[PDB]
Design a protein around this ligand. Sequence first.
Ligand SMILES: CSc1nnc(NC(=O)c2ccco2)s1
Length: 282
Amino acid sequence: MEMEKEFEQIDKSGSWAAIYQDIRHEASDFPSRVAKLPKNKNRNRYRDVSPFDHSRIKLHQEDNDYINASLIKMEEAQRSYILTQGPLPNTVGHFWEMVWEQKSRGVVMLNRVMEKGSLKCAQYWPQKEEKEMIFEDTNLKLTLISEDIKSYYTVRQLELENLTTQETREILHFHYTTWPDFGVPESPASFLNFLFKVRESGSLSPEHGPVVVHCSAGIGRSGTFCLADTCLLLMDKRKDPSSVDIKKVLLEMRKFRMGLIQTADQLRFSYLAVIEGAKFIM
Ligand SMILES: CSc1nnc(NC(=O)c2ccco2)s1
């Protein structure tokens, strides 16, 4: 079926939970043996969210190459994304090592450091120009260059320096600051505006390594972001845009990381975002 009318048909019939459970039943199951090794317990935020072995990002290290991060490679859309958990106190250096080694231009953050009165990820970037951060375990230095605070999101320019080689690179930090502590946004308008700002920066384009996207677990809000982006790109590329099947795209993405889209409300919100976004594109 088309999307917008499949949408009203699920709303009128109140069957979002049944649609979402079908997706969960059909989703791929692949091994995640490296994630479950005892030496990696303090590298995982949640025991039930792990990267598959076949698609995990490897750190360029001989001691321990593990990080909770996956490469999502979308062949028809010609887009790639790295989806990862929010960094932990003992993985902030690994996180920036990955950004460096994978040649990423942008980092997309979809959570606040504290939500619901608890910490959802480490404070992993500097908050003042004159107070830089040094990650001694991976030999990197990170400096805040500039910050632009808007009503729904903040954009930061950061300098990452590889202290071994003295090479430097400019990284863009795109921080969506207004996702509610509970539920999903009422309108997709500010989320779509944010996605378009990431696109306009070049961070999603083939001349750079894959964008790094995270929330707390790296599967819910993060899954919504890449699902919406890929579906809108396919609607631009194909002769028949009504052929784009958001459930099929989501199952393809779940071949590369488990659990993408965590609730039926996130599934409904993803439909809403793609539907509204397709009208603005034209
Ligand atoms: C204010 S001067 C300074 N503080 N901290 C530095 N290094 C780190 O904060 C760090 C490494 C891993 C997590 O935090 S340089």
